[PDB]
Amino acid sequence: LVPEKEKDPKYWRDQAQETLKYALELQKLNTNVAKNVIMFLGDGMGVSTVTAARILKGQLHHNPGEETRLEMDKFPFVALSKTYNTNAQVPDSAGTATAYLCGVKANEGTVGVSAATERSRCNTTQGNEVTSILRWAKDAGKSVGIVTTTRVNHATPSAAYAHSADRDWYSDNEMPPEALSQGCKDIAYQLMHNIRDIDVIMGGGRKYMYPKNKTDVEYESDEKARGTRLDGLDLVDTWKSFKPRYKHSHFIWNRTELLTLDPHNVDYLLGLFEPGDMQYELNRNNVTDPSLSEMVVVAIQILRKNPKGFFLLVEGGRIDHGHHEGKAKQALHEAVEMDRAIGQAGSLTSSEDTLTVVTADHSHVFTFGGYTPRGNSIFGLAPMLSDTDKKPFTAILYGNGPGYKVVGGERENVSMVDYAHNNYQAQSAVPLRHETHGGEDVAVFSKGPMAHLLHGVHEQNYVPHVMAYAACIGANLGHCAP
Template sequence: MRRGFKSVNVMMVALLVLMTAACGDGASKDSRVKNVIVMVPDGFSAAYATNYRNYIGGQASTLDEILVGMAKTRSLDHFITDSAAAASAMATGNKVQNGAISMTADGKALKTVLEGAIEANKATGMVVTSTLSHATPGAFSSHANSRVQELEIAAQLIGKVDVLLGGGKNLYSPEDKKRAEELGYLYLENRDQLLEANHDKLFGLFAGESMTPEIDRDAMTEPSLEEMTNKALEVLAPNKNGFFLLVEGSQIDYAGHVNDAAWAMREIEAFERAVKSALEFAKENGDTLLIIAGDHDTGGMTVGNVDSSYSIDLLHHVKASGAAMIDYWKRQGQDLKEVVHEYAQVELNDDEIRAIEESHYYEATLNQIISDRAGIIWITLYHTGVDVPVYAYGPGSSKLFGVIDNTDIAKVIAQSIGFDLESAEGVE
């Protein structure tokens, strides 16, 4: 019996060593953390991860290789969180009410890990495909009683964050852009300007609102998430005190809200490319902590269903988002059946055409039909409360093993860079 116990103990120790090595944690010397990269695939859950793995042929994704645990996501006032409350928890280590941007219920601003990085004289950056003032980037960088206060959130970013890349041009006036330039930012509006930029402060607004969905994006005019991430790393890395970078794959969530499986897979693919860049940087720089975690699940996507075959390869043939196909039909007057055949390689039958035409939500109905052909069912157009995967690499990453709360992400970051969240009493 004793011999058996010894064998089990040896195996457990070996397993722990392997798990630690896989995350690149080494001796877990938090003092070695110079840079922190937080990447948020908004709306992403285990079902998205499984479908994406199958979508790329069944091989492990870059994310699969650094999975460390799962995170609970509920907000202060609801079992189902929204993006603002989830991001605020990840940024401040505190639960807040749905809709709040790093603010307590009584209107007290909570310090964020990005603000902690600024106090530590680190460079900071945010890269998103939403507007820069949207819920997730807003919660890491700003404070507002409600996420709908995007103009107020947008105004807080200029002069605070060194690299700002994303959408939201319509939220800034010419005076705002002039102020940014006076504060030393290089203002950018397209992909070429981004790729050519050689400056230590960047303010890139590449779309009026959110950037174009990856599945519809003109690669010659709007930069990809990977390109924006690479440029941010290039600009931030020279800072002698290190940096904090937030990267959000914002539109995985958007696709989930309209049940567009093909769009979701393209967004995850774009996000994975950005992850590869960040992970390569972290591996080359042993003082970098990389954390990747979804904020919540969106849509309740399934992986196959009992009543139909699972044919996710079908999604490779879809060349436009459901929104774009509906636009071709409703606004440009093209034949619906021909549009869907051309852009999705799907032959709609009469019942499906009728269902779309009579729907109160054309886009979601079309997307659900295409998803069903691929064997994917959605249970909602909104968020769900399931736990989300957490991925990590680098010093301190072992502290994220197992089932954690989303607030633990902020606490691990704060400890790694020497910022005491517990003593934070808000900001003016």
């Protein structure tokens, strides 16, 4: 390939010098207070995923891809974070969630409780609850918002509002008899009850709000889509029942309604768009369900109204479930979508008053290599066959996962399959039903007020302490001297 400009050294020299110029300008720091704080979480968005998603964004624009700049690559400050859990070398989504949201690391499986709480032991929850940055923001008067493509009671969003001993306790249906008897409340219940005045809530997880065997509006025929609540409660009503009557509060379940809403009119918005998790972006129906980008836009429009500010938590989410199934095309595409929503949030907010942080809870066993040439598709094959089995191999390869396919002592001859298909599973070293997480460190991109405080290699619990300090919320309100 080699573009003709990339053959000339002056091109690279000017490129670096201009980057040097801006780097020198960034010595003048943004010490302003963070009126708003927005946190993007790519579930499973390791540095390997970020690079591959960069190539994909550019390749979808008929470019080689390596030289493309993701919206998160345009953030000025980058830092790594150590994801290890108190119990787990390779962490889960729940324990990490307690770290970057509540400011404390916890055991695998727990949500919003310290390491003293034992998983599935409900009687150890009491006294060990840890509040999240969401609460600190609402307690400081700011509006709060949660947007995700996974269930609203999934592990990543649940750490914002709930304090449960097990992340699997989505509704009272999944709770064991002892847990209910000890007084534990399910995650869905805690969504409406813990913090009642949560301004914006959008995402999947509809079935966990309606009583059991109740028929779902979008899929009335689906037995899976039926409600799960043994309590016989309409939590959707319970949502508005805690809201003041004089305040306009709407519940929506499909995209047509979402686009029709006027943000100046809506003071509280609850949107459950699917019984379970929302579909992948490659499988989304254009008319019925909304994309993450549009969902983030309407949220900011609603939340911008509060003069005290707002906190918004967005989760790409589905990247995790994508890597879990070994379908790199699904996961990588989800990552590009979140990047678009990050760029849109840049047009809806100002860098002077809004602190934006893009990070991930953990990495994955996703590997992308094979000495591919410049421009070679991110889902493409290696240039040469393996010296051993004389068979070609994909550039994308997983360590462990369901992509391991060995036919009778021979690895799959990939030249005859559709490896570019959306649901193709790259080869694996160890067969597993689902691919595992990764203990590697993840990146933290930060732009805005006090983003230079997210420097270097530090722990994962450190991230929310920076945001809270910049916004003058939480425990350390020293950024604004009284």
